[PDB]
Amino acid sequence: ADSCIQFTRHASDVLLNLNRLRSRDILTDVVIVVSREQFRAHKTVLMACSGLFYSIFTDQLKCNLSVINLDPEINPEGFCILLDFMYTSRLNLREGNIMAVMATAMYLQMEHVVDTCRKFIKASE
Amino acid sequence: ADSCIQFTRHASDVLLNLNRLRSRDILTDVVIVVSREQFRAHKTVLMACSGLFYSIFTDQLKCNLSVINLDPEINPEGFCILLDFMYTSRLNLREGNIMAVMATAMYLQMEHVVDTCRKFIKASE
């Protein structure tokens, strides 16, 4: 209907509660492995944020996997920063991590993050 | 870190994509039954929006159920309106459905919705 009312803070509150489920390890259904590191997450949040995870979890065989191994060139800290961004909207971008974050965002197909990284690099430059 | 940047539209974009997964029936993992009607959804979105679903899906036995039957007094249209609100932030509140929506929101433990219903009822009256 065109007659709906909207609760402004709803989407933010849902995301905060999804991140609280991740903290508490509630209903997490996949482990992402990045070299020696493991990260537990919810497949639906990953698919909602990343073109790569959308492709993986819509594949008729990979949708059933409980462990996904990323390419060994992916930096675990870069992945951790992007997983935190998926669950919070906040990106911990620093001079010391920007190249790894940008490369990880390119691989995960997260264009907005790639764009801000490119802008911060261009400004320095 | 206190040095993060934030993407304003991220939470809204995640919620829109979760609702697109629900439309496409991708990764839905529970059927909610409300009398003669069935609704497919994602347990994590339900838990993030409703105190009742948080309690159900954190219970060590009920977390494994693929079907949850609601109380027969719950109106299916009222539930449909609240499920759409969970996935979109928009509440289709109308004179013809407000009592059912309020009763359903009380049962699902969705206090903000109960509050707006009470306000709209008080204004009429």
Binding site: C4, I5, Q6, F7, T8 | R90, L91, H112
Partner: peptide, 5 residues
Amino acid sequence: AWVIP
């Protein structure tokens, strides 16, 4: 909160 979207 609530608004007209």
